[PDB]
Design a protein around this ligand. Structure first.
Ligand SMILES: [Mg+2]
Ligand SMILES: [Mg+2]
Ligand SMILES: [Mg+2]
Ligand SMILES: [Mg+2]
Ligand SMILES: [Mg+2]
Ligand SMILES: [Mg+2]
Ligand SMILES: [Mg+2]
Ligand SMILES: [Mg+2]
Ligand SMILES: [Mg+2]
Ligand SMILES: [Mg+2]
Lengths: 392, 234, 45, 238
RNA sequence: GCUACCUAAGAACAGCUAAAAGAGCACACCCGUCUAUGUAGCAAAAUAGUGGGAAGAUUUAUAGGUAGAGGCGACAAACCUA
RNA sequence: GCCUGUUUACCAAAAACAUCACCUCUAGCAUCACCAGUAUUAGAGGCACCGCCU
RNA sequence: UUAAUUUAUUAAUGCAAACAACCUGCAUUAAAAAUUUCGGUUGGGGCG
């Protein structure tokens, strides 16, 4: 069954006048008249070329003629790729082993009450209320508005700890930063073009979480596979691409080392919003891409087990539910499925507040639920603060 | 009239496609089918009825994973999003198709009959006689056209030479080359018969307009020898 | 109840009785020709 | 090959005795043609023993062109004549495969458009009264209208009782005899009769003696006189 | 450009009772049961009261379509510029 | 009359029309309606929910 | 409408034409329609 009905398909040109089939005679067409008339033969106009370059009337060359065209098809992963298998697919692509829960090294950063923010619960409740209720003149702010706002306000609240931690001065949250990283996986060349937003850069690299013994023990772990779904599914298969690895910044940029990738799923429509598993997969892939770009920049474009693993954190949130990730890239030898494997600690579905009431629900003229968050969970914010304070 | 069919998309995709209602009107704007109009706005999901469609630069039998089973507004039967290799496609889900199940699509006519597991596609020659089938083709590679409504199931009545006799749900025999593919089991949503519309409003939602109010009363024309007995008075 | 059958709208006016539509068909062209022959100041609407 | 044909017929239900009988039945017909015709028959759904009996009766079918046989089988399937339905139809009229498709189509069209028999009713009529196919047009319409108007028999009854099986001569003889005797009465415009009419089975199916005794209650001599008189009247009318 | 139906993409539906309703009461809104006025009238079908529906088969703005040996019609032979 | 609804704009709003439900007839099928559908479907029509006895 | 006259038009078939189908010509059968009419006396109505 072919798609596209004939009536909608472009109409076939009318049959040529029989006069054109007679070798010896030149047909009399209305070309000289410079307009159509129904009683003269239809001219066969030669193909026309503008003769110069007009940007607003540009006709790009066929895909095969582009300089970067390559027979080998790369598979790109960008901010708007939704993996079918989600976390499993991301782990297979990045040659990564998953660990439930954040590492103790970072989780302990908030155990002592000195790191605890003064009036922390009040501040977090105020941030949530500002994001969800007080943000704009509209009664019910949309996600497109309160997701970036909630993330930024949480980041500012954490940044307020500069008092206790002067080392927080050596970092900056840049926006619109884009990185690119390419690598091979069983002869499949995979690129990640991470755009997202809110890259937290630091002047110093993050300390390694996994020890040499753990990195080696990752060898025994077998990379989970899924059949018949290929790992390439949902990745943009492109034959016109470039293989350069880009960290997103020119050489000599202060704050070169990525610290946290803040990914936000702010789409108003549920279908346009990533599922939690797909968002975790995107977090894994972007963290791996940034770490791999850092490794390629530092230790060259050589496939090898990294002597100094690269650590990158990421927080992927939909405005209410958060997902926390710490990715340790400890090998650029991705092609083979055997050997030491990168490893990611993930905390999934940490919901800051289970629901928010913008209006007071009234039954029989009785206020049942007051305006404001209900079911607030400070554990998610302590995890957020632990990630922010990590490395300082 | 300036009517152009909405069925203009040329490339298959999983996205629901915005479809324009016809109202029973031709491209000329005149009503051609009565009782059609209005109803809930719908989006069309392009169903891949050629279940054995090996991916590009690929061939031979292939397996697929049932990502999900979904209600289809444009059909009585329900559809299934199913993914294989690096592609996804909509198919017509069978009675017991479940999310996460595995489906087989093969073109191999084995010497022995293949174990008929519901939901997979084999050439009619590969099926045991008497197995319930659906999404049957008329010609090899034409694409499923028969036994596509909810709960319908044809029977592979006979197999002789390269020709298989199928019993369509209307209990009519049909001859098809045994190389043409069909899927095992009965179509999903088997309980579609028992659905009760309940009220005229539900039909209007479904898009069916009320029947004409006109009262409609041919006849056997008597032969001259019989005209004397047509209306014998009481 | 009746009398106000005219609900003005320039889009409908031009799309129904405009110069382009009159020229769009031979019958409309003959309409314009008849108006021109009669000497109408307003050939189309 | 004889080996291939014998293997195919060992499949398809036929036994060794049936295969040997079919081979003897071959009147100088190629083994491939025999296999093709038997395949078409079993595709229509005839069991191997009915197929063997039919071919024993009429070996001429083996000579039919394969394309013609396939076209006729498809037409029969569309008409719904298959399996046991086609079995006794072939038993009665083996020429259905030789009759002109135009003849069959015009018979069906007379039964449907000019006799207003439903599709299922027409299939049942063909199943139960194969002689209708041999019966010429015009005569069949006259028989049906005789049942419908003069006898006041509706389509469901005309189909349930194999009225079209009997001959118009017998039908007119018995019915007109009863009508003139007063036993039968054509229904009025409202479809009502003073006395309930005798059943079509009691008129046609029963033997002559039973019809004259149980229903007509008259003498065979009088019936013979009436038959001669009716024949003379028909001759004069024509 | 009315009206019958339809197509595309829109919009409206207070409050109370119930609970997810072709539910009840009742605004806006749509209609037009009965009475009265009016009858060259405010009106070539209106006004006042009364009344039916009023989250639905609802109402409705915009653009488009179906044209007369035709259209459209939940048939009234209704409507298709009084 | 099952019901909610529809109708003779401008003398008839109804027991009339429609209506879920049930019943009858027709059709084995692709690239402009039906339908990007396939007999549990689609069209034509009768009657009027449901429920009972025969 | 079982009033009269038609099949111009569609759908089928048949025969020609041409090499199974399509197209054309001629027939036949239906569907659909098209044109036209509906005498006189007998208070009306029925049967006359
Ligand atoms: Mg208006
Ligand atoms: Mg309300
Ligand atoms: Mg209500
Ligand atoms: Mg009426
Ligand atoms: Mg009338
Ligand atoms: Mg009523
Ligand atoms: Mg009402
Ligand atoms: Mg209406
Ligand atoms: Mg009125
Ligand atoms: Mg009124």
């Amino acid at each position: 069954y072919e798609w596209g009905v004939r009536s909608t398909r472009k109409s076939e040109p009318p049959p040529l006048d029989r006069v054109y089939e007679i070798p010896g005679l030149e047909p009399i067409t209305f070309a000289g008249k410079m307009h159509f008339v129904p009683w003269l033969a239809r001219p066969i106009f030669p193909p026309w070329d503008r003769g110069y370059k007009d940007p607003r009337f540009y006709r790009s060359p066929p895909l095969h003629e582009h300089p970067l065209y390559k027979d080998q098809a790369c598979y790109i992963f960008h901010h708007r790729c939704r993996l079918l298998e989600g976390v499993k697919q991301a782990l297979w692509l990045t040659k990564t082993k998953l660990i439930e829960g954040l590492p103790e090294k970072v989780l302990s950063l908030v155990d002592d009450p000195r790191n605890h923010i003064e009036n922390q619960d009040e501040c977090v409740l105020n941030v949530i209320s500002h994001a969800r209720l007080w943000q704009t003149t509209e009664e019910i702010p949309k996600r497109e508005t309160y997701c970036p706002v909630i993330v930024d306000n949480l980041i500012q609240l954490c940044k307020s700890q500069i008092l206790k931690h002067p080392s927080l001065a050596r970092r900056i949250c840049v926006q619109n930063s884009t990185f690119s990283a390419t690598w091979n996986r069983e002869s499949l060349l995979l690129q990640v073009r991470g755009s997202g937003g809110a890259r937290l850069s630091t002047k110093d690299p993050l300390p390694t979480i996994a020890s040499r013994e753990e990195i080696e023990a990752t060898k025994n772990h077998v990379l989970e596979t899924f059949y018949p779904i290929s790992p390439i599914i949902d990745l943009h298969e492109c034959n016109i691409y470039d293989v350069k690895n880009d960290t997103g910044f020119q050489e000599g940029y202060p704050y070169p080392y990525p610290h946290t990738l803040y990914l936000l799923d702010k789409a108003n429509l549920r279908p346009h919003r990533l599922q939690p598993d797909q968002l975790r997969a995107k977090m894994i892939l972007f963290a791996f891409g940034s770490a791999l770009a850092q490794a390629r920049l530092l230790y060259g474009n050589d496939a090898k087990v990294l002597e100094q693993p690269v650590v990158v954190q990421s927080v992927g949130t939909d405005g209410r539910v958060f997902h926390f990730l710490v990715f340790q890239l400890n090998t650029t030898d991705l092609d083979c499925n055997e050997g030491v494997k990168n490893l990611a600690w993930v905390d999934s579905d940490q919901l800051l507040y289970q629901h928010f009431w913008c209006l007071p629900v009234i039954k029989k003229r009785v206020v049942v639920e007051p305006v404001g968050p209900v079911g607030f969970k400070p554990e998610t914010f302590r995890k957020f603060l632990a990630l922010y304070l990590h490395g300082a | 009239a300036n009517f152009v069919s909405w069925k203009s998309r040329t490339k298959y995709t999983i996205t629901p496609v915005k479809m324009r209602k016809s109202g029973g009107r031709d491209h000329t704007g005149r009503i051609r089918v009565h009782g059609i109009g209005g109803g809930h706005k719908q989006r069309y999901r392009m169903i891949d009825f050629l279940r054995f469609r090996p991916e590009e630069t690929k061939s031979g039998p292939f397996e697929e994973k049932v990502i999900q089973v979904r209600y289809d507004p444009c059909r009585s039967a329900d559809i299934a999003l199913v993914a294989g290799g690096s592609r996804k496609r909509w198919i017509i889900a069978t009675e017991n198709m479940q999310a996460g199940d595995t489906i087989l699509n093969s073109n191999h006519i084995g010497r022995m009959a293949v174990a008929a597991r519901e939901g997979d596609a084999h050439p009619l020659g590969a099926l045991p006689v008497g197995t319930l089938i659906n999404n049957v083709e008329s010609e090899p590679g034409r694409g499923a056209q028969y036994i596509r409504a909810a709960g319908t199931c044809g029977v592979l009545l006979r197999k002789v030479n390269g020709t298989a006799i199928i019993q369509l749900p209307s209990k009519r025999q049909m001859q098809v080359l045994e190389t043409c593919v069909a899927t095992v089991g009965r179509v999903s949503n088997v309980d579609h018969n028992k659905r009760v519309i309940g009220k005229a409003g539900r039909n209007r939602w479904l898009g069916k307009r009320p029947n004409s109010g006109r009262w409609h009363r041919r006849k056997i024309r008597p032969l001259p020898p019989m005209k004397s007995y047509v209306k014998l008075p009481s | 109840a009746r009398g106000n059958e005219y609900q003005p709208s320039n889009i409908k006016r031009k799309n129904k009785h405009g110069w382009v539509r009159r020229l769009s068909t031979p019958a409309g062209v003959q309409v314009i020709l008849r108006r021109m022959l009669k000497g109408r100041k307003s050939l189309s609407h | 090959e004889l080996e291939r044909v014998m293997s195919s017929l060992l499949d398809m239900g036929f036994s060794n005795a049936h295969i040997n009988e079919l081979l003897s039945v071959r009147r100088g017909a190629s083994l491939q043609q025999l296999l093709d015709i038997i395949s078409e028959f079993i595709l229509l759904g005839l069991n191997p023993e009915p197929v063997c009996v039919v071919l024993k009766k009429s070996p001429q079918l083996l000579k039919l062109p394969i394309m013609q046989m396939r076209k006729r089988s498809s037409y029969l399937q569309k008409l719904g004549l298959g399996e046991g339905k086609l079995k006794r139809v072939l038993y009665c009229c083996p020429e259905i495969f030789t009759m002109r498709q135009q003849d069959i189509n015009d018979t069906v069209r007379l039964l449907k458009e000019k006799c207003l028999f439903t599709v299922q009713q027409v299939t049942k009529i063909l199943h139960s009264c194969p002689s209708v196919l041999r019966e010429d047009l015009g005569q069949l319409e006259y028989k049906f209208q005789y049942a419908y108007f003069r006898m006041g028999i509706k389509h469901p009854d005309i189909v349930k009782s194999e009225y079209l099986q009997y001959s118009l001569t017998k039908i007119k003889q018995r019915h007109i005899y009863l009508e003139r005797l007063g036993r039968y009465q054509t229904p009025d415009k409202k479809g009502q009769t003073q006395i309930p009419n005798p059943l079509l089975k009691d008129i046609l199916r029963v033997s002559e003696a039973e019809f004259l005794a149980r229903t007509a209650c008259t003498s065979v001599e009088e019936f013979q006189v009436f038959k001669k008189l009716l024949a003379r009247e028909e001759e004069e009318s024509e």
